[PDB]
């Protein structure tokens, strides 16, 4: 009974989340990509191997691959935007 | 071979591409095509003076092509553009 009497608010907030997800799709469509090393800034450069300096030490290098990978939570399409906005609305991982 | 600490081949010239440079990029492959004509001059020099040590062309794109071909020697941090012999010929004091 409590669920039935409160269905009006759920529809309104779902519609608001949908609108914000559409706006977020328009704003951050595909812009969340990044390379494995913060030196190459396009997919044509994020290929091959690179030297990684562990913990910022210049005397402790290690070879690692370059991968042009998308973010775990992004705004590519409507479903991804809705998921990201849900995680934000749960007040968790939203600063990142 | 004698007067050489490694196993070498005179049939062609080896190419060293540093780790922080991706082979197969447009810049590198283009440099790997027109430099393939140096191998004939590498053999011609060795014919006249058989007691000739490494002949190397240090490209400004990073890759170094040396003759005779021999396998390269932890991680590899070699870069031909930072070598003392490259720097003196790329500029003045
Ligand atoms: C840069 O790469 C180019 C692409 O491979 C090279 O151009 C090709 O060189 C081939 C080797 O000579 C040519 O094949 C033969 O060339 C001789 C010389 O004129 C002729 O017998 C014919 O043109 C040809 N024979 C065939 C096709 O049966 C290619 O024609 C030529 N062009 C292509 C493949 O488009 C360049 O040589 C290379 N640069 C350097 C410095 O090596
Ligand atoms: C090399 O130098 C010698 C003298 O050291 C000289 O006689 C000779 O002509 C030069 N060239 C060749 C191909 O030996």
Swiss-Prot record, chain A:
Annotated transmembrane regions: 9-28
Disulfide feature: none
Subcellular location: Membrane
Residues reported in the UniProt entry to bind Ca(2+): 92
Extracellular topology ranges: 29-96
Expression sites (tissue/organ): Expressed in pancreatic islets and in brain, where it has been seen in cerebral cortex, hippocampus, basal ganglia, habenula and thalamus. Expressed in the small cell lung carcinoma cell line SCC-9. No expression in skeletal muscle.
Top-level taxonomic group: Eukaryota
Assembly mode: Voltage-dependent calcium channels are multisubunit complexes, consisting of alpha-1, alpha-2, beta and delta subunits in a 1:1:1:1 ratio. The channel activity is directed by the pore-forming and voltage-sensitive alpha-1 subunit. In many cases, this subunit is sufficient to generate voltage-sensitive calcium channel activity. The auxiliary subunits beta and alpha-2/delta linked by a disulfide bridge regulate the channel activity. Channel activity is further modulated, depending on the presence of specific delta subunit isoforms.
Protein's job: Voltage-sensitive calcium channels (VSCC) mediate the entry of calcium ions into excitable cells and are also involved in a variety of calcium-dependent processes, including muscle contraction, hormone or neurotransmitter release, gene expression, cell motility, cell division and cell death. The isoform alpha-1D gives rise to L-type calcium currents. Long-lasting (L-type) calcium channels belong to the 'high-voltage activated' (HVA) group. They are blocked by dihydropyridines (DHP), phenylalkylamines, and by benzothiazepines.
Domain comment as written in the entry: Each of the four internal repeats contains five hydrophobic transmembrane segments (S1, S2, S3, S5, S6) and one positively charged transmembrane segment (S4). S4 segments probably represent the voltage-sensor and are characterized by a series of positively charged amino acids at every third position.
Disease: Sinoatrial node dysfunction and deafness: A disease characterized by congenital severe to profound deafness without vestibular dysfunction, associated with episodic syncope due to intermittent pronounced bradycardia.
Family: Belongs to the calcium channel alpha-1 subunit (TC 1.A.1.11) family. CACNA1D subfamily.
Record's protein name: Voltage-dependent L-type calcium channel subunit alpha-1D
Organism of derivation: Homo sapiens
Swiss-Prot record, chain B:
Tissue: Isoform 1 is expressed in skeletal muscle. Isoform 2 is expressed in the central nervous system. Isoform 2, isoform 4 and isoform 5 are expressed in neuroblastoma cells. Isoform 3, isoform 4 and isoform 5 are expressed in the aorta.
Positions annotated as glycosylated: 33
Subcellular localization, as worded in the UniProt entry: Membrane; Cell membrane
Changes after translation: Proteolytically processed into subunits alpha-2-1 and delta-1 that are disulfide-linked.
Additional notes on this entry: Binds gabapentin, an antiepileptic drug.
Associated disease: Developmental and epileptic encephalopathy 110: A form of epileptic encephalopathy, a heterogeneous group of early-onset epilepsies characterized by refractory seizures, neurodevelopmental impairment, and poor prognosis. Development is normal prior to seizure onset, after which cognitive and motor delays become apparent. DEE110 is an autosomal recessive form characterized by profound global developmental delay and hypotonia apparent in infancy followed by onset of seizures in the first months or years of life.
Free-text note on domains in this protein's UniProt record: The MIDAS-like motif in the VWFA domain binds divalent metal cations and is required to promote trafficking of the alpha-1 (CACNA1) subunit to the plasma membrane by an integrin-like switch.
Subunit record text: Dimer formed of alpha-2-1 and delta-1 chains; disulfide-linked. Voltage-dependent calcium channels are multisubunit complexes, consisting of alpha-1 (CACNA1), alpha-2 (CACNA2D), beta (CACNB) and delta (CACNA2D) subunits in a 1:1:1:1 ratio.
Record family assignment: Belongs to the calcium channel subunit alpha-2/delta family.
Function in brief: The alpha-2/delta subunit of voltage-dependent calcium channels regulates calcium current density and activation/inactivation kinetics of the calcium channel. Plays an important role in excitation-contraction coupling.
Designated name of the protein: Voltage-dependent calcium channel subunit alpha-2/delta-1
Organism from which the protein derives: Homo sapiens
